[PDB]
Ligand SMILES: CC(=O)N[C@H]1[C@H](O[C@@H]2[C@@H](OC[C@H]3O[C@H](O)[C@@H](O)[C@@H](O[C@H]4O[C@H](CO)[C@@H](O)[C@H](O)[C@@H]4O)[C@@H]3O)O[C@H](CO)[C@@H](O)[C@@H]2O)O[C@H](CO)[C@@H](O)[C@@H]1O
């Protein structure tokens with residue numbers, strides 16, 4: 001009944017051999033196996049991992065179900081999407097190493113059988129999977145709702161999650177209206193403080209100036225369509241560097257050295273010899289740029305002005321968020337930055353040329369943020385499993401609360417970030433009446449209730465407070481056009497933004 005850490009993958013390899021759909025994920029785990037085992041040993045030396053209860057865990061991979069018709073397993077080796085498979089691989093491995101009893105499902109049959117068996121304590125699932133869960137179990141699916149952790153790469157903002165509020169705003173997202181606690185949404189990057197950051201591990205095989213060809217650039221973009229209207233950009237880079245590619249070819253200049261779609265180990269070799277990894281603008285927020293940076297590549301990161309969102313970009317229409325991307329990879333831009341990441345206006349030929357010349361003259365510094373290491377991911381998911389409880393113990397602890405007042409036109413996300421903090425939506429409940437507001441030296445001469453994502457709000461001219469009337473509408477996202485927002489912030493560990501200092 002207590003969890004014991006695992007240091008041998010033999011049982012995991014047995015579980016993943018049982019579906020062809022797991023093949024790509026099994027090969028990833030195999031490539032990274034020695035790093036994983038080193039990391040769970042290192043974590044166990046730093047932190048008491050004793051006295052943890054072994055959980056029975058459902059892992060339901062909706063994206064790999066026949067019944068989903070997503071056909072992601074089908075394209076895993078031929079240039080199809082991999083970012084979700086990377087995250088599922090790393091989650092399953094983390095759960096396994098931490099000693100939990102994992103029940104892996106990629107079918108309605110397995111889903112039914114596991115949930116039939118009872119004693120499930122935690123459920124990892126995607127939004128496509130959650131639709132299947134609800135249909136399969138019937139009305140008692142809600143009995144398990146507080147155990148769900150929903151892998152949702154791009155994030156779900158509260159205004160899309162609240163079914164009635166979303167309807168009232170005319171949000172037609174096919175992904176939203178689940179009415180969960182939004183911290184139950186697990187994201188690919190820490191872009192949505194209403195949600196939890198799950199992430200993944202960045203694959204790299206280094207243990208360097210002679211290995212790396214100073215002259216060699218590699219284009220990020222494994223599909224021909226991605227290269228449309230990039231020729232001035234690529235011509236500037238080609239003035240100074242060889243331009244290589246991994247494309248599965250009418251958009252691709254004649255001078256480009258195409259290697260085709262590479263296996264994991266061959267791609268990693270290509271990164272380790274590359275000076276510059278070249279963003280074209282798409283895809284958004286993938287793992288590949290972090291893999292490049294972990295291998296000592298600089299990343300040329302197209303700047304978006306205006307920032308891209310469901311308001312101006314087809315890709316984002318129907319996604320359950322209004323979040324705006326300031327670049328192809330905002331995490332790389334904001335949490336890494338120069339010299340590893342150069343965020344440039346692709347239409348500023350002088351800025352592009354200056355960036356390429358700078359990168360040519362840079363010293364090579366392989367870099368991985370701690371939160372994207374094996375040990376960083378184990379520490380984060382262990383903390384979530386042990387401390388995150390939506391089933392009713394307050395975590396993060398109230399000690400971590402720092403209250404900030406967002407100016408008009410400023411969100412709670414923005415005001416926390418501007419103080420090197422992060423919005424903590426679990427603390428909004430402590431900011432939502434006259435008495436609580438005195439504590440933080442805001443004085444409500446009058447007040448009212450509103451069901452609005454933009455409250456609690458303060459008019460400092462009229463000394464008027466609007467408080468939240470629907471607790472499911474508490475939202476880090478959103479700026480009040482007229483009033484100040486009363487914003488719950490917390491500290492974060494540098495390199496581990498998911499955790500406060502007193503959260504371990
Ligand atoms: C796996 C998952 O749900 N990932 C996140 C999701 O991302 C979207 C998702 O779409 C999955 C596939 O769903 C259907 O099977 C199709 O619509 C696929 O499109 C394919 O065919 C199109 C032609 O009809 C073509 O335009 C396109 O090139 C593609 O080959 C979808 O791929 O997964 C993909 C893969 O990363 C992603 O690009 C999609 O945005 O978004 C959810 C909401 O934000 C998120 O919760 C989830 O994690």
Ligand SMILES: O=c1ccn([C@@H]2O[C@H](COP(=O)(O)OP(=O)(O)O[C@H]3O[C@H](CO)[C@@H](O)[C@H](O)[C@H]3F)[C@@H](O)[C@H]2O)c(=O)[nH]1
Pocket residue numbers: 079080081082083084086222223246267283284285286287288289291
């Ligand atoms: O055929 C396709 C494929 C993708 N896309 C789009 O690209 C998006 C992100 O691609 P992907 O998830 O595979 O991540 P990427 O950064 O390329 O890294 C993978 O691929 C890398 C190898 O290139 C690998 O090293 C890394 O670990 C992986 F995560 C995906 O959500 C699709 O919208 C597409 O439209 N058509």
